[PDB]
Amino acid sequence: MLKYIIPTMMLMPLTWLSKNSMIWINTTLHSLLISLTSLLLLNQFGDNSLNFSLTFFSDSLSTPLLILTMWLLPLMLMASQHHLSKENLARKKLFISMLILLQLFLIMTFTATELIFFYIMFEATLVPTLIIITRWGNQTERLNAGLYFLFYTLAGSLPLLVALIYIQNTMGSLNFLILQYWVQPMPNSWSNTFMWLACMMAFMVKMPLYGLHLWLPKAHVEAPIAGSMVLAAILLKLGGYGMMRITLLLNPITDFMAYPFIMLSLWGMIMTSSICLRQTDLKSLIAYSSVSHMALVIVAILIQTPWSYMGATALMIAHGLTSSMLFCLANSNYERVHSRTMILARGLQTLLPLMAAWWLLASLTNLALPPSINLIGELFVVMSTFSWSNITIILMGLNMVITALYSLYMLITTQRGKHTHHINNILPSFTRENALMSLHMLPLLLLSLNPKIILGPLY
Template sequence: MMTLLLAWASICLTIIWAPSNWLWSFTTAHGLLVSLVSMYLIFNLDSELFIVDNLSGPLAMLSCWLFPLTLLASQPKMYFEPMFRQRVFIANATLLQVFTLLAFMSSDLMMFFFFFETSLIPTMIIIARWGAQDVRLDASNYFSLYTILGAVPLISILLVAYSTLGMLKPSPELPLMMWTTTFPYPTFLWFILNTAFLVKLPLYGLHLWLPKAHVEAPIEGSMVLAATLLKLGGYGMLRTSTLLQVPLYHTALLCMVFALLGIMITAFLCYRLTDLKALIAVSSVSHMNLVVVAALLHTPWSFSGATAMMIAHGLTSSALFCLANTLYERTNNRTIIILRGALVIFPLAGAWWLVVVLFNMGFPPTPSFIAETLIFTSLFHWSKIGFFIVCLALLFTTGYSLYMLASTMRGPFPLHIKVPLPFIIREQLLLVLHIVPVIFLMIYPSLIFF
């Protein structure tokens, strides 16, 4: 584990000593090298405090893979900042990556909670300092307030349990306390354990911070939020679900109803949104509520489907935010009606949009389709009505995905944009590095369930 931490700490040397003209090139290359080395070290991890299994391994690899991509996407905005601020930005992004990686691999629930909450600090700095508009401070406050308030019940019960029973030895199941099997109020215990995760995921009704944070965050913040930080909530839910021996859909039926309705309502809401980044952010709520349903079903198939859904959504949503950012850099606007007609000027961009939108709506045989098949199968055995609701929401998901594609690509190009810059090699490479892993998982889907 020390080798892994030292590998990430070595990026600080590049941040400090890299020449100004080569700062982003050196740090991106160094970050890619460290990410590849980390993926190798993750499989050979030998530590009692950190684990890698079928759940934490794919998410940790996803976090490593996306780190150099965030640096690659942030260059245009950060290039005109003072050099000291550029170095601070890269250092802050590296710190966020380390906290996220340690959270995914922590074997003890208290340690996981520590890194889970610590990731709030660099994320809040990214939104508040490098956000696009003045209301970025409000978005940062929303994000921090929701996260902190949601964490209060969990930290309270953790402190009581650890002070009463003492620190338990770490194991792959993240044991919390010996009395979970005999606790008289399992529903109350489940809500206490999962409030922080439901806010971070987020569950519909607790999601109001997400569109604001996504819209105001820079591209690096949007990519990290959608690809890894939201997955911390799903990861926590899947881990803590093993602490209760009763079926969760019996003890948390109200949460299941909110999740099923949230999938439907957010899909409807996407048709009314005019901001492209807000549309992508709200669509993430719909996908993540499907993870909540999978965690509550508490079956091996639903757990496998939730893991596949988090991996697929992490790559797809990050690619969507990159595409939205490319249009924003050329138009200085995120309103969908103003972004129309890009296919006429950028035909290759239209191909990228088509591929990523197909990934987003679960076109066979993408990883999203595999994940939805696994979750839908488990849901069908539990409730036919719930299965019908989710299938109906899937149709609306296809509709707003095609609406997003048609609204940005088709139609006449705006006349007020005189000199649209073509897509450059950096942007093409960024999209390729998002799409290639998805195609690789289509060929070898067993890699998600190693």
Template sequence: MGVILFSSFGVLLISFLGSSNYVWSVLVFFSCFIFLFCLVIFGNDLGVICSIFYNIGLDFTSVPLVVLSCWLLPLTLLASLGHLSYYNFISQRLYCFLLSFVLFSLFLTFSSLELSLFYISFEATLIPILIIISRWGSQYDRYQASIYFIFYTLLGSLPFLVSLLSINVFLGSLFFPFFDYFFVFEFSFNDFSSVWWFFTFIIFVVKMPVYGFHLWLPKAHVEATIAGSMLLAAVLLKLGGYGLIRLLSFFSLVNFFSLNIFLVSFCVWGSFITGVICFCQSDLKSLIAYSSVGHMSLVAGGIFLGFCSSLNGSMVLMISHGLVSSGLFCLANLLYERSNTRTLGLVRGYKCIISFLAFWWLISCAANLGLPPFPNFLGELIIITNLGFLDFSFVFLAGGAVVTSAIYSLLIYQLTQSNKIINNFSNINEINLREYSLIFFHLFPLFLLILNPLLLFINF
């Protein structure tokens, strides 16, 4: 793991000190090297993962998110080549540094064993995204999006800081392994345990974000560059789910059953309402952003259930959604770079111009709606099944959320690929090899996730 941190730190240095002629190629090479090194270390050797957990803090919850982060960094660099061609090299160098800094902070977040280091690295990931939105955003509204981003971040982070200080006073330490022995016994009979519970989890609810705390996300997605949207959808939203899973066990013996019922109901209802809101969106990027809110609300509902199987379903849905949502933003960016608009009424008929692009849209939309055998279907099925164990009425509500997700995913494909093309868009550039590779490397891991359970079943 030290090699991974050293390599990611090397990526930071290359982005500032590297030669102007080779900085892009070297950054992509080092990013791919980090990803391949993660695959070698975290393969299928359970003993290696267990030993890494006791020394650094990685386990079966954080390892998939680390690999996802390493996989996406070279893809964000590839996606940014077209956008940054209009800026000078100093701006490009700063942009690469910020993306590399996000990767370095994610490593610290997913591998920290102390809650204070987790909090610092967690908040550090927000600074580069804020700079990317405010500096490289395409419209003047990027400043309003930055204000929303800061406001909601402070709304969640300050109560969490108060919670950290309170836990440190009672336990004398913020070291994760100590919590299993002392945390529950200290807080289970305390009158203020529910307050600490709320302060601890509100930062992650805002970060995911769950419906009701989501207003910053569509604005941030619409104003961010393609790399910012990819990182927000694929990794940074997953920090909220990771924090919920990591800290939920510390309150497992505290009796919050009625509060959990309320939160599960709120998350599942928010997932359904978000699907309905997607029907009212005219901006393609905003529609994809609201679909992320709906999926992450369902993930939060599975996490608040607290069952082992529901947590596994939430992890599957988080990883698959990270790949699918990032791929959808890349596809939307391809259309925006050729038509200079994201309005669904204007972006249409691309099947007649770039026929093979319709195939990528079909696969991405099918994966987003949870069509079997894509991993989204497996994650949603596990979560809905566990919701039925709690209350069978949740099955109908979550099923309605899945149905609305299927409808707006099919609408995205139908509106962008079908209908008569507008004459102004008839002379557009073909998709080049870099853009085809970008979409392929988003969808290729999904097929690996499909084949892995099948191979295990055959071997069994």
């Protein structure tokens, strides 16, 4: 793994001692070289996980998320100009280097052996995105956005530290094999319930669940595109992967104590699909869409079936791709017209004639068009939850109906029917945005061809 880590450190002074009108090509070129290098990772086989010696390993769950992350980085690094392509050279290098350091802590967080190393790199993943969205948030409440962001994520993520030091100093070291291979079932005390509540509630904050979901939408609509896509995709699915790690312990008590979290997740999935049917501020609809899909993920994690884990990881990776794409489209529309609202800039079927195809393809992979990976994830989650209970399928299909409803309402609202003929400033599409579209939707359909990769450790 350190051969997949140290060129990211050596990629940092590339941006510094690359001169003017030259940083862009060098950063994009070498991050794509890193994408090939990480595409060379996939070797994992059969019985065990793949150890990258003593500090590191990878399950077949961290591997697709890691390859997704290092593929998502050049997409973002090309995505993040035209709102800072006219700013200063030193601040531009600082921005790009902060993105690279952010990627470095993302890979550090996904490739962890010990949960203490995982927690340090977890809040190391936290800290740069704060600076990025607060400095370039481009709206008058980005202060409140970053403030709620850091305070919710620390104030929830903090008792996880105490619980992990407790598991450190009562049951040996914290290898995942040695957290495995040795864990005795801890019975139903109340202290076990508090420790389970600490760990699971910290990652509940990071998902978010329904009771803590207003963490998200300000930190998307008052944030630039780079921090938005990193935030949504890698941070929410990073919290999901963290719970997928830590849920191996405490099995005889999660049955008795995991009923209300399933409950808040289901009812919040329904109410969040309802809340993003009517709003303006187009950027926020994808944020509440992400809240709905992550509530579905949390139902899938807290029931403990291998079918549920396969559907969980498929839904994670497919929704990461879909949400990152659809955020990039909303960025393109806001760069066209500086409104951020929904009812104003209609039309756009006449003009931007092939951008409509990308809105269509993004809204249909958000619709769960059935050969895509998104319906694979949602389908196996529905199968496992109907095995869990015989009556929850009404809530799942009700989510499905309203999800199709708001996604296709987003499609036929902003880009269907009538130009308001006072806009009269938008230019036709650049090759850069369409290049980002072809960066988005070719890996999703290629994974739809060969999906035996992204299914989890319980393949």
